[PDB]
């Protein structure tokens, strides 16, 4: 029913004809995923641009919802004995300062800090290791 082509800025212009053909004859919803470069990639396409025009931009996530996500990563993914950290405005300033809202960076930073702190024996995450990963990104 649906053909999700992830990283759909890679495939050559001469295969958009075949994905057009698939969507054209089989009645299959083709969903092209990709960085913004994909849009320019189809911009050159004359029908690909017409056929694939409904879109859904990924949110940047910044704001109170970002604050929720931060705490949501503590419980769901970090899985540590509760340390009463609670991602206070300090850690939030650090993470807004460091990640710029990208979920990847939120994940990359938190996993690194957790691994570092557990490798050095620290049971929870200190402000020290948070400053460490912050500087070593930017």
């Amino acid at each position: 029913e649906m053909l999700i082509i992830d990283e759909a800025d890679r495939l050559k212009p001469e295969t958009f004809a075949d994905v057009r053909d698939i969507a054209e004859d089989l009645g299959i919803a083709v969903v092209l995923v990709g960085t913004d470069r994909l849009d320019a990639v189809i911009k050159r396409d004359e029908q690909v641009l017409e056929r694939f025009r409904a879109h859904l931009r990924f949110g940047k996530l910044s704001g109170e919802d970002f604050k929720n996500t931060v705490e949501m990563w503590e419980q769901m993914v970090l899985k540590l004995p509760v340390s009463s950290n609670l991602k206070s405005k300090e850690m939030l300033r650090i993470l807004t300062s460091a990640t710029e809202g990208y979920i990847g960076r939120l994940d990359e930073i938190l996993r690194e800090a957790a691994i570092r702190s557990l490798s050095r024996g620290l049971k929870k995450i200190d402000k020290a290791v948070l400053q460490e990963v912050a500087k070593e990104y930017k």
Binding site: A40, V41, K43, R44, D45, L49
Partner: protein
């Protein structure tokens, strides 16, 4: 350094102007012409071209046996010294271009004879470039002015080739240990340029009066201001200025009288007048030259000396540069006769500098440069600004070109239309054509000044400490990239349409004049007191975003 020039026409009798035209057009300019030719055929000429310093006294030495010449005699001492000075500085710029051309030709002949390709480098020198390149890199990158001078000095085939390779390869951590193309293209471009250089190996001059007092001021019996110059006191000219420039001239007479009334206890040298040219403008019509062309004074006035508070700044600059001059001359033991006269004049100025004339009272504004007005230059928008905080990351206020040129926008539109028309006419002019100034004006300069005034005023409103401007060198790449960005913005991937639209855009939206704008902003900001820094304009983004990021990059580099 806030030197500015005011001007005023000089009106006098026809006989008073026949003397000045004949004295200059028939005897003073020919002295400059001969002084220029002689300074060229001087044996040490090629020694000068290697340096940037023509000797202090050489132009004077060639003029002393020239003052008594049958065709260069009767010139007032100021006329003679002006001509000498003209030869030093008019021929200064002349021989500066001369040694650019002459010494460039010499170096091209030399680089052509010595510099070589990678193949000939291996054949003759045959040194491994990676090793010596990395060695020089750890020598220089690990005061680098000495190292760069050493690169400027090393000329042996292996040494110059390797050091230039290191310089053009990045002189840093580059993972591509390659590109003998550096000295390959060096020698190739040298051969082309040496081929080129082997194939190609009605208004009198002004009167610069380097002394302020050579112009003696007086008030006419009708109250008008009058001038007569040193060496020509029988020639009296009446200052026909404009009321905007009048307070300078009334200051000149007042300053000169103030020194007179103190029995020369006051230092001419804190005068609001520093020097003055005496040029002839060009008139329209016919007639003897003195009756057509308008004699004009161009007084260079240090605007900083107008206020009494500003004078103390000048009083401190001169009292610091001159007390250093004394110490510099006090170490020598030569003790020449006229040298001690020069020493004597110095301490005379220091004593005379602490006698203050009456000037207006102004609390010179103190500027904190942390605020960074960022100015972005482009094609689609000729100029946009962004007043942004650096400690924070918020933009206080943007302004676009339609908003800085208040009521001056129709001027920008009609100037773009005029620059289109004049460019089409110049292209239609081909090679054979009448003078191309037909229909030209200085509307571009008026707009480049209206824009600078508005930008500086905006900076002053928000207490901005510095105005940031793009480096002028990166103003061809920036405009080319902006044209490309607009092209892909209009036509996404249709390359034919992109090229066609780029052509049609270059037809209509011509390149701005990003030299006069950067210069006018530099003048206006320096006059007001706002220092100017330079950053790197981002390649893409919206003009407001480009301005903001330029301003932030400037502060980031200032942090260094």
């Amino acid at each position: 350094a806030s030197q500015i020039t005011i001007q005023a026409r000089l009106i006098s009798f026809e006989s008073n102007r026949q003397q000045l035209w004949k004295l200059m057009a028939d005897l003073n300019t020919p002295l400059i012409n001969e002084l220029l030719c002689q300074l060229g055929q001087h044996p040490d000429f090629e020694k000068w071209q290697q340096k940037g310093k023509l000797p202090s006294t050489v132009v004077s030495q060639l003029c002393q046996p020239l003052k008594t010449d049958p065709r260069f005699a009767g010139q007032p001492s100021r006329l003679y010294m002006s001509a000498i000075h003209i030869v030093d500085y008019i021929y200064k710029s002349w021989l500066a271009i001369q040694k650019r051309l002459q010494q460039q030709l010499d170096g091209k002949t030399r680089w052509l004879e010595m510099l070589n390709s990678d193949a000939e480098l291996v054949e003759l020198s045959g040194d491994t470039l990676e090793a010596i390149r990395v060695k020089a890199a750890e020598i220089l990158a690990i005061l680098s002015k000495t190292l760069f001078d050493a690169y400027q000095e090393t000329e042996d085939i292996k040494s110059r080739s390797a050091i230039s390779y290191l310089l053009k390869n990045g002189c840093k951590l580059t993972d591509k240990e390659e590109d003998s193309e550096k000295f390959a293209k060096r020698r190739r471009q040298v051969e082309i340029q040496i081929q080129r250089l082997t194939e190609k190996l009605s208004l009198p001059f002004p009167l610069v009066f380097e002394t302020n007092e050579d112009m003696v001021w007086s008030k006419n019996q009708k109250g008008r201001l009058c001038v007569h110059f040193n060496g020509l006191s029988d020639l009296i000219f009446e200052v026909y200025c404009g009321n905007r420039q009048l307070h300078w001239f009334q200051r000149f007479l007042e300053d000169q009288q103030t020194k007179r009334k103190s029995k020369n206890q006051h230092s001419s040298g804190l005068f609001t007048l520093r020097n003055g040219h005496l040029v002839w403008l060009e008139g329209e019509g016919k007639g003897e030259p003195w009756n057509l062309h308008h004699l004009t004074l161009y007084c260079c006035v240090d605007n900083r000396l107008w206020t009494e508070e500003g004078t103390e700044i000048v009083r401190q600059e001169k009292a610091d540069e001159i007390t250093k001059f004394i110490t510099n001359m006090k170490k020598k033991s030569d003790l020449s006769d006229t040298q001690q006269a020069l020493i004597q004049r110095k301490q005379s100025t220091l004593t005379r500098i602490n006698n203050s004339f009456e000037r207006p009272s102004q609390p010179l504004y103190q500027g904190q440069s942390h605020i960074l007005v960022g100015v972005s230059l482009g094609l689609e928008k000729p100029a946009t600004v962004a007043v942004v905080d650096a400690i924070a990351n918020k933009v206080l206020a943007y302004r676009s070109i339609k908003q800085l040129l208040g009521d001056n926008y129709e001027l920008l539109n009609r100037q773009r239309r005029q620059q289109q028309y004049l460019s089409h006419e110049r292209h239609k002019a081909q090679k054979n054509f009448s003078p191309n100034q037909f229909g030209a004006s200085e509307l571009g300069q008026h707009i480049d000044r209206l824009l600078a005034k508005a930008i500086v005023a905006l900076a002053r409103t928000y207490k901005a400490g510095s105005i940031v401007l793009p480096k002028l060198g990166d103003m061809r790449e920036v405009v080319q990239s902006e044209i490309q960005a607009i092209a892909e913005q209009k036509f996404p991937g249709y390359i034919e349409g992109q090229q066609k639209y780029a052509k049609q855009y270059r037809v209509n939206v011509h390149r701005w004049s990003y030299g006069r704008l950067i210069q006018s902003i530099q003048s206006k900001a320096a006059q007001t007191g706002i220092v100017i820094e330079e950053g790197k304009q981002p390649i893409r983004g919206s003009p407001h975003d480009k301005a903001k990021e330029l301003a932030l990059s400037a502060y980031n580099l200032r942090l260094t």
